Structures are given as structure tokens and as C-alpha cells.
Write a protein that binds this ligand. Structure first.
Ligand SMILES: Cc1cc2nc3c(=O)[nH]c(=O)nc-3n(C[C@H](O)[C@H](O)[C@H](O)COP(=O)(O)OP(=O)(O)OC[C@H]3O[C@@H](n4cnc5c(N)ncnc54)[C@H](O)[C@@H]3O)c2cc1C
Ligand SMILES: Cc1cc2nc3c(=O)[nH]c(=O)nc-3n(C[C@H](O)[C@H](O)[C@H](O)COP(=O)(O)OP(=O)(O)OC[C@H]3O[C@@H](n4cnc5c(N)ncnc54)[C@H](O)[C@@H]3O)c2cc1C
Ligand SMILES: CCNC(=O)c1ccc(NS(C)(=O)=O)cc1
Ligand SMILES: CCNC(=O)c1ccc(NS(C)(=O)=O)cc1
Ligand SMILES: CCNC(=O)c1ccc(NS(C)(=O)=O)cc1
Lengths: 588, 588
């Protein structure tokens, strides 16, 4: 147990020191490695409950049982007198750089997970390379280092969401006494895009600076794993070459899908293109009903667009469906049109995009409803948000032996190991995991610590909270109500709910009974909170803190005994009492 | 003993039915009481883990061990056959209304705690009177039913805080692409006050409607306890009379103090006057340094005012002083002036308030610094916020025997009982308890349930979360850093901390390193989280949810294993790692 942990740790750490905080011999080795700028992991045996056993086990490798003991890539290098000898003789640098491979770690993909993993590994002396390449979209859009969230995901989406929220702020200000007239103010799309892109550019630069200052090699090159330890790279000039690494982390993410209909690739766009578009989209059709589809339709309408969403079946498939319908009803009440039970059959081009005058084109969209009636209408911009998929055939030779599932994602053990023992996968391509930036960051940091610093902590993928940044935001943590009932049965499930009105909405004359929250609980387990849901402003700030409590096993009793902060929206969770079974109305 | 809980429940309840959910005889009794419009408490014995022993103990009062059994004010009334006999003989209404006192409960004070206690008691058939009277301020300001928070506290303060926040929203909107020019926009104080006062009026009317719909007698009259069961009332026409009650709840709150200096009462105002003031305060001096003082100074400056704060010693005494200093620095950088280490000596009138043209007067303030130097400057409005105190002399006669402390607050047991067995106190006048509106509401509802429905749950006053709504808001739960070090020793305390920047502040070009958060933890108790602190936008929404986790005993490992929601301010709590002992900088 201890011995099996010690062997895995010694075998895969690049540079690691076994030590005690009280030992001045260990301190003298620490000072020598620091002076020579040699980074390494450290395990302080006196701060572990079974340091005694570990000290004994080290002898199976070094034939000594004292501290310090220093190792490089699975090899015992020496005790204090031996390390000092190598240093004094100008031999230590060459010893710590000796390796069978070019790199201790190669990360394929420079996004949320891959950047996190690579920087963390380098902290412990692992010689690291991070590869990143951005295949341009069909119209040629491309961007810098940092992945989907930084460049064409969470960051620009929430900034445009905030531009949309500020329109209601301008309306609210009149009621709170400010002299402006909202009716005489307009929005300039390209001014907003310039500011968003300027912040994204600071992020691109900041990541390149951070890899430099951690001695990580950054290659702006497309990678392909051709054997367990060999990565083929293709640079911007089409020069092909091969590098080797001990450990491989696959972190290449996904890209948007297009439906297989005439005109889609040629004349529509995706979210990849939207966040840097030089012109305002104009009258827009959004095809799809994911959170990407609704968030984009939402802020486009708040910025003055004429917007329609075409929905194949339901909104937010996989989310609690009562909450999804409340989300959609609010958008429909504040300007978004919906073409329900409808799919597209073709896109026809009526005008080409005007690069000169900076204006969209014009399109004719033909489709049909599930009963066979026809859809036909003209739009200036058509955005497809119909899912995302990995392209691992471009990343992964079939002969390496890395197993994939029926969706093309990588099958991994609970420590992110693929079917090939030195190869791991993290982020959106890890099958069955929540596809979110903080998950990918936590998985990559934790994995790097296990590979190169002897850590054991695993990433916990259960009960991970989410927020959908629609015009009225939807936060959630845990099970939907229909999932809870399916798993435990209706008689074992109690639901507490209530409407509420933000105090900020009162003087602004906004709606009385639109915001909503519920707790889904299990009767036979001390009224354990199985799921939490809230529709209202700042839903991400509201929901985050409760995710710690649900992680700890919170029950309805724990919510009741905690006192609220007044006046907040979030405090309504501490006094819930109306049950759905009672039939009593949840209005205020 | 089960027996002594049953004895206290039977003695104190107004009308209580002991029942079982499966028994059709209990069913017919419930329907009869419903048709007769007789409200009552119900104890369903088949849902309690010792309903067996309770059935046996009921024999001590009724000489029967079956169910249903009805009691009224400590007297057994009968089983199913007997209750029906009374109903069909038109004797039931007289039997349930027979009592030694006019009321089962008299509440003195119609605020946060008192209204909540009174409405809750009435649901269990307690015949209830609620007394409220608002003694006018020195300039004659008065208001309606609902207490300090509703009329001159949390509600108007946070609505004017929101008016101030909207000013920065106007400036932000230009950077996000909206065509307005913030420089040409001004604020109208009286328009804001009208909207705020219209919302307060709807709450005044709502509480009167609530009391009427719960059959609660509302007397707009000053009440005085003269013996354990006798309350002397004085109405608006000076008419004096007496009413009697079984239980009494004191819930009369506090009012602001004035310093004992010339001119203060005559020419200054307090928060009581500020929220309905008919003219803009103009150039304003706020005297004091509590949360009331800083919150009022902050929104006044955001609405265009010229504002100074005179500080005797420190800001926010009793709060974490590192956080208090960050709060004040932000305020000083954004337009609030501070006259530090300074007290006032006298207020001289230069110009009377102009009621007709709706203009403030003009004042000369004289004071001095703790080293001896002099302060002299003119202001149009001087606001005192130097504490609040009860006036229980006006409420309670010395001879009744209710013990007070050296501050004038009522000394209570952990179930709100005074030194007089039928008299309880709740809210701000309960000595040693946190003085907050949700605390008073929870104490009131829980006390009512114990008196009239046989409940046993107590109010938990520990680790109650707070938020100070200064221009940059400050939320907290648990111990300050200095208090934890004093209690446990510096070597046993670890503090994790970080600056952060809201995503919304990036395009708006706001400050990089002013928002700040920290966790104060106990090493020898598994890194238990002893206190959480956050300075940033929406701080009360951020803080509330973690209050549940802290109530459950969260440790640092609990915060680490929970995943963040991105992009939010609150997610920074899930990845903290820089300790103060390490000396590493916390900037981003
Ligand atoms: C519109 C949108 C909004 C979103 N909003 C949120 C949100 O609010 N919150 C949230 O938590 N998540 C959000 N997400 C999800 C988030 O973007 C992803 O979960 C996250 O970025 C996944 O990170 P990753 O490291 O797995 O992959 P990515 O971030 O996609 O990074 C993979 C990188 O590898 C590169 N690459 C691919 N193939 C190769 C190759 N052969 N060689 C070299 N490099 C290669 C890619 O070009 C890319 O740069 C959003 C996603 C989208 C599309
Ligand atoms: C400016 C300000 C801002 C605040 N902001 C917040 C905030 O954001 N959050 C928060 O949680 N708390 C806040 N508070 C505190 C909160 O208002 C109080 O904790 C709360 O009102 C206490 O309620 P209570 O029931 O104890 O007394 P009150 O609400 O003060 O009610 C007592 C009532 O009894 C009446 N009364 C007094 N004597 C008699 C008598 N003899 N006969 C009849 N009636 C009588 C009083 O006039 C009053 O109507 C704030 C307070 C102030 C002053
Ligand atoms: C002329 C291009 N035609 C296509 O059919 C196509 C290519 C790539 C796509 N996506 S990507 C950028 O490889 O992520 C989508 C569609
Ligand atoms: C600095 C990175 N190290 C870690 O995260 C870490 C490593 C080992 C630990 N424990 S053990 C009992 O030796 O396996 C704990 C933490
Ligand atoms: C709705 C009002 N009732 C209560 O709050 C309550 C009372 C007693 C309880 N339990 S007991 C019988 O004392 O064992 C539980 C709950």
C-alpha cells in the first residue's frame, strides 16, 4: 500500500527530494538546488502520519533509510554529501537533465485544462511542452492561445451578456431618479466587440508570458500522437517533425457542429465566429436550443436585434425542464421569438456579406414543423448552435490503442488514465464528465500533482454546479426534479419552492412573480438536498456557496437553521416552506 | 421527560388536537373545527418516534389513551363523540373562546420580530393583539407599521444604495458600447424619495392586510407593561385603558442616539429623518463610523453630494479591521472625505431650513482632534450615526421585575424567556444577540411555535452572516482574523487570501486589485473555517450560501474539493492557496 504508492511516485517524478523540516542536511540540499535553479518536488516525511514506513520503504530503492534522498526520473542520485559533490564538481546540471525522452510531459492542446496541467507540472521540475493550434472556421476566423473559453466561450459570452444587462440598468436608472431618457440611447456593436477583443488579447499575451516564466516550451503547432511516446508536429510552414515525452496529456477540446443541409457551412456561422464579428448580425435566426443557443439569442435581443430561435424539440435538454420553460418564457416575454417543433431544410443566399461597407448579407431559410407545415423566412445572419464534437481522428492514430466511446470521447479511469498507461485525457474530451472550464482546470492541476509530486487527491466530478447566463440567469446544483423522482420514486421526494422579487425590481416596476427557486429533497434520508435551482439575477453568485454545503451532505434542516442576510435574493433559500404536494401557491 | 414536554405543551397552547393521520375519527374532528372556523395546532402522533409514550402521558390529563384528544388552554375538552356533541348543541364556540385573559398573546412592538411572532401565533388559534406606535423624531418625522427595517432601515437604505450603484452602471455602459454621455446626466433626489416612499407605503398596507387576514387585533397605541399580565395602552386621542394577556412578547426595538453637545438635537438629523427628507441634503457631514454612517455617506456621494465623515477612532468597530480599512480606502478614493481622529463640540445654526422652496439650511460645525487641533467648517446637513439604544423605561414598569443589563437590554434565557416566566423578549432588545432583521424574524416565529404548537426548536445565534452595503460591499460570516488569533493563538491560525477582479470590470476599466477575500482557518482542527470575508460587488449574494457550509463545520478541504462556477466572483473561494504566513503577494 505504502510501498505501491512509493514506487509509482519515484518512477514518474522528474526531480523529487525526500526530506524533513527539522533536518539541516536537507536544508543544505534545498539551498544548493535553489541556487542552481533546479526545480523539484519535496515530500516532508515528518509531516505525514506514516513517514516512518515511507522512510523504511525508500531503502528498497537507495539502500539507505536516512533523509535527504534525491531522485531524478526514477533513479536514486544521492544523499547530502553526494549531491554536494556533484554540485562542487560541476556535474549536477547534467545529471538532472538526463532523460530517455525530449520532455517529461507533452500536453496536446493549449486551453483551460492543458494550460493548467502544463504550468502545474513545470512547478515540480518536469520538462514540459504545450502544443496549441487553432484550425480556422469555414470563413477563416482564428484566435490566440488559451482555448475555447478564453477566446470564443465563457469570457466573451459573459461580457456581451453584461452589455445586454446594462440596457435594463439604463431603464431602471430613470425610476431611481437619474435624468437620462433610455428611449434616445442606442448600442454600437463594433465598439463593444473592440473592447471585448482587447481584453481577450490581454489574456492571450498573459498565457504566453506565464509559460515563458515557468520554462514551459510553447509550440504553435498541430500535434498528432503516433505511438505511446511520440508526437508528430506540423508547424505554420508545414514542416513536420517528431518529439518524444514520457507522459502525454490529451487536452484538445471540441468544435461546433453543422447540420448536413445545403447552405449551412457556406452561409451560416457558429459561436466561433460571433464573438469577433466586424458587423452587427442584424435580424438573426439561432438554430438550436442548448445553453449556447439561448445565451446568444438573449444578449442579441437586449442589444436591439430582431431575433428568432428555432427549436427542434425542447429547451435545455438535460436540465430540469420546469426551470427551462421558465427561462424560455421570460425570453419570449422580453423580445425573443420562438419557432417551436421546427428544423431547417436549406439556407439560400440572397446577398453576399459586404466587407466594404461592413454589413451582413441576406439569407432565405426554409424548414418544416413536425406536423409537416412549412417554414420560410428571410434573415441577415443564421447562427447554428446544434452541439459540439471532438475530432480525435485528427489527434490520435488508431494504432496507438487509445479507446474511444460511441461519441468519439476518450474512455478514462477515475484518475484520467486512458487505455495506454502513460497517456491521459482531461477536459471536454474525457467521456462522461461535465464539460466546463473549472472542471478541466481542476482535473489538470490535480493530475500534474499526482504524476510529478506524489499527490493522491482525485478530482470529484459529482454535484458540480452550473449557471446558464440567459437574460434572467438560471443557476443549479445537483439533480433535476424529474431525475430525482425517477431514481427514488415520487413518494420519497419532497419539493420546497417559492417565487420572489428582488428589492431592486420594486422601484424599477419589474415583474412580481417571475423569479423562482426550489429545493428537491429525499424524505427517507433526513430530507437530504438532492438538487437546488434558482432563476433570477446574479444566479451564479447566489448558487456557488451552496455547492460547498451540498458537497458536505446538507439537509433541509441545515438550510432552516442557517440565518439569512437581508436584503438579498439568496436569503429566500433559508426560509422555504411551501411544498409542491400541499398544492399551496408559491407566489409572494 | 416526554411527560414534562407534554405538560408544558398542554398548559401553554390555546387550542391543540392530538391526532393520527390514518384515523377517520380525527378526520371528522378536523372538518368540524374547519367548518366552525376554529384554528388550532395539531400533533400527529403516528409521525413521532415516541408517539407511543405520548399517548400514555395524555391519560394524565384526560384519563383516556386513544386519539383524537382536544385541549383548550390547558383543559381537556373531549374525544370525537364529545366534540361533536358540543358542535351540534352550539356550545363549541363558547368553549374554545373561554379564557382568563383578553388575549392569549400581546406583542408590544410592530416591527420585524413582533409582526412575525404575532402572525405565527395566530395560525395555531392563539388570540393575538399586536401593538405599534412610532414616537416622532425631534423634527416630527413619523411613519407607518412595520418597524425600523421596513421604514427607516434595511429597505430604504438598500434602495438608495442601488440608486448610487446605477451611477457606475451609467459610466460602464459607454465602455460596453451604449451611446450615452454620463457627464450630461444628473440625479433628482426628490424623485427617488417618492419612489422609495411609495414602496414603503405598500409594505405598511401589506402588514395591516396580513394582520386582518390572520384575525390579529392591531392597535396603533403605545403599550406599557405594568404587571406580568397587564398592558396599559394609550391611543392617539390620549385615552388610557388596560388589556390582559397570558403570554407577553416585548419587541420594541431601538432608536438613534444624539451626542450630548449643543445644537445636536435642534439642528442635526439621523437616519430616521434621512429616508423621507423632502430636500437633497446638499453638502453633508456624517458624524460616526458604524455601518449606518458609512452606508449613508457612500450613497450620498454616489448621488452627487459633497460628503465628509468625522471619525472618533476607527471604522466599523467590532468588524475585521483589515477589511474595514479596505472598505474606507475604496470610499476615500471614490469621493468621500474623512476627518480622522475627530469629535464634534457644537453645532451652530447659520440658516434655517427653507420648507417652502424645499432647501436645506446651513450649519457651522466645531470640533477638535485627539491631539488638540481644531475643526471648523460649514455644512448644509449634519447627520448623526453614533449608535442606537432601547428606551425600556418607556415600555416596562420597574415593579414588574424584568431584569435588564447595564446597557438597558433585556436579559433572557436561550429560549427568549425573561426573569418573569410569561414574558419574553425578541429582536434588538434581547441582550447579547446580533441585531439583525432575519434574526428577529427567526426568534419570533420559533418562539411562537414553542408557545402554541408544542415545538422545541431553538434559534441558533452563532456564526450569523452579515453584509455592509458600502459602495464596494463587504460580506462576512464567523470570526474576524484578530478575534481568531486572540482565541486560539497565532501559530494555530492559517489565513488563505487573494485579490480578484470582476469580469464585468475589465471592459469598464475599473481597478485591478481592490476586491479581496480571505478564509481564517484553525490548523489543529482539520483547517476548520472560522471566518470568511469578501469585499466586492454583490457581496451578500456571494456570502449567503457559504453560511450554510460554515454552520455545518466546513474545512478548507471542503472548499477545495468543491468546483467553481465560471465566470463568477464567488468561484475564487474554491481555489484559494496563498497563505499570509508565506508572504507571497495576493495580487492577480
Ligand atoms: C459558447 C460557449 C460558452 C461557454 N461558456 C461556459 C461558461 O460560462 N462556463 C463554463 O464553465 N464553461 C463554458 N463553456 C465550456 C468551456 O469552453 C469548455 O468546457 C472548456 O473550454 C474546455 O476546455 P478544454 O481544455 O477541454 O478544451 P479547449 O478549451 O477547447 O482547448 C483545447 C485547445 O486544443 C487545441 N487543439 C485541438 N486540436 C489540436 C491539435 N491537434 N494540436 C494542437 N492543439 C489542438 C484547440 O484549438 C484548443 O485551443 C462554454 C463553451 C462555449 C462553446
Ligand atoms: C439605518 C439602518 C439600516 C439597517 N440595515 C439593516 C440591513 O441591511 N439588514 C439587517 O438585517 N438589519 C438592518 N438594520 C437593523 C434592523 O432594522 C433591526 O435589526 C430590526 O429592525 C430589529 O427589529 P425589532 O423587531 O427588534 O425592532 P423594530 O423593527 O425597530 O420594531 C419595533 C417597533 O416597536 C415600536 N415601539 C417601540 N416602543 C413601543 C411601545 N412602547 N409601544 C408600542 N410600540 C412601540 C417601534 O416604534 C417599532 O415600530 C438596519 C438598521 C438601521 C437603523
Ligand atoms: C470548406 C470547409 N468545409 C467544411 O465542411 C467544414 C470544415 C471544418 C469545420 N470545422 S473545424 C474548423 O474543423 O473545427 C466545419 C465544416
Ligand atoms: C505540492 C504538491 N504536493 C501535494 O499536493 C501533496 C503531495 C503529497 C501529499 N501526501 S502523500 C501522503 O505524501 O501522498 C499531499 C499533498
Ligand atoms: C408547524 C408547527 N409545528 C412545529 O413546528 C412542530 C411541533 C412539534 C414537533 N415535534 S414534537 C411533537 O415536539 O416532538 C415538530 C414540529
Amino acid at each position: 500500500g505504502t510501498s505501491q504508492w512509493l514506487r509509482k511516485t519515484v518512477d514518474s517524478a522528474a526531480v523529487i527530494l525526500f526530506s524533513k523540516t527539522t533536518c539541516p542536511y536537507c536544508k543544505k540540499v534545498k539551498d544548493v538546488l535553489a541556487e542552481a535553479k533546479i526545480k523539484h518536488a519535496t515530500i516532508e516525511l515528518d509531516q505525514l502520519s506514516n513517514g516512518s514506513a515511507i522512510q523504511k520503504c525508500l531503502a528498497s530503492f537507495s539502500k539507505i533509510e536516512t533523509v535527504p534522498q534525491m531522485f531524478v526520473r526514477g533513479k536514486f542520485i544521492g544523499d547530502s554529501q553526494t549531491v554536494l559533490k556533484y554540485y562542487s564538481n560541476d556535474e549536477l546540471a547534467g545529471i538532472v537533465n538526463e532523460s530517455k525522452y525530449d520532455y517529461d510531459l507533452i500536453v496536446i492542446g493549449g486551453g483551460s485544462g492543458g494550460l493548467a496541467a502544463g504550468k502545474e507540472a513545470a512547478k515540480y521540475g518536469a520538462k514540459t511542452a504545450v502544443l496549441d493550434y487553432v484550425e480556422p472556421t469555414p470563413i477563416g476566423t482564428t484566435w490566440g492561445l488559451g482555448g475555447t473559453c478564453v477566446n470564443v466561450g465563457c469570457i466573451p459570452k459573459k461580457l456581451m451578456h453584461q452589455a445586454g444587462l446594462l440596457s435594463h440598468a439604463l431603464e431602471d436608472a430613470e425610476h431611481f431618479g437619474w435624468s437620462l431618457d433610455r428611449s434616445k440611447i442606442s448600442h454600437n456593436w463594433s465598439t463593444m466587440v473592440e473592447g471585448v477583443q482587447s481584453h481577450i488579447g490581454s489574456l492571450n499575451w498573459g498565457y504566453k508570458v506565464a509559460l515563458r516564466d515557468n520554462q514551459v516550451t510553447y509550440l504553435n503547432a498541430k500535434g498528432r500522437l503516433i505511438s505511446p511516446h511520440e508526437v508528430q508536429i506540423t508547424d505554420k510552414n508545414q514542416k513536420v517533425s517528431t518529439i518524444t515525452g514520457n507522459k502525454i496529456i490529451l487536452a484538445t477540446g471540441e468544435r461546433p457542429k453543422y447540420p448536413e443541409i445545403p447552405g449551412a457551412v457556406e452561409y451560416g456561422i457558429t459561436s466561433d465566429d460571433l464573438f469577433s464579428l466586424p458587423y452587427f448580425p442584424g435580424k438573426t435566426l439561432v438554430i438550436g436550443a442548448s445553453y449556447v443557443a439561448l445565451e446568444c439569442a438573449g444578449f442579441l435581443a437586449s442589444l436591439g436585434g430582431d431575433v428568432t430561435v428555432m427549436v427542434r424539440s425542447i429547451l435545455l435538454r438535460g436540465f430540469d425542464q420546469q426551470m427551462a420553460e421558465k427561462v424560455g418564457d421570460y425570453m419570449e416575454n422580453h423580445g425573443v421569438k420562438f419557432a417551436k417543433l421546427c428544423v431547417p431544410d436549406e439556407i439560400k443566399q440572397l446577398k453576399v456579406v459586404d466587407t466594404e461597407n461592413n454589413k451582413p448579407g441576406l439569407l432565405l431559410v426554409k424548414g418544416h414543423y413536425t406536423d409537416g407545415k412549412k417554414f420560410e423566412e428571410e434573415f441577415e445572419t443564421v447562427i447554428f448552435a446544434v452541439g459540439r464534437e471532438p475530432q480525435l481522428s485528427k489527434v490520435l492514430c488508431e494504432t496507438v490503442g487509445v479507446k474511444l466511446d460511441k461519441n468519439g470521447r476518450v474512455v478514462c479511469t477515475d484518475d484520467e488514465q486512458t487505455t495506454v498507461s502513460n497517456v491521459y485525457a482531461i477536459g471536454d474530451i474525457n467521456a462522461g464528465k461535465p464539460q466546463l472550464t473549472p472542471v478541466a482546470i481542476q482535473a489538470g492541476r490535480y493530475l500534474a500533482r499526482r504524476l510529478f509530486a506524489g499527490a493522491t487527491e482525485l478530482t470529484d466530478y459529482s454535484n458540480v454546479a452550473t449557471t446558464v447566463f440567459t437574460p434572467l440567469e438560471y443557476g443549479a446544483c445537483g439533480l433535476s426534479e424529474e431525475d430525482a423522482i425517477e431514481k427514488y420514486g415520487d413518494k420519497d421526494i419532497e419539493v420546497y419552492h417559492s417565487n420572489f422579487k428582488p428589492l431592486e425590481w420594486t422601484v424599477a416596476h419589474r415583474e412580481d412573480n417571475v423569479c423562482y427557486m426550489k429545493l428537491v429533497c429525499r424524505k427517507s434520508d433526513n430530507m437530504r438536498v438532492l438538487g437546488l435551482h434558482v432563476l433570477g439575477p446574479n444566479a451564479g453568485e447566489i448558487t456557488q456557496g451552496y455547492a460547498v454545503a451540498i458537497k458536505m451532505g446538507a439537509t433541509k434542516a441545515d438550510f432552516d437553521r442557517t440565518i439569512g442576510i437581508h436584503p438579498t435574493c439568496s436569503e429566500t433559500f433559508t426560509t422555504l416552506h411551501v411544498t409542491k404536494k400541499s398544492g399551496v401557491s408559491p407566489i409572494v
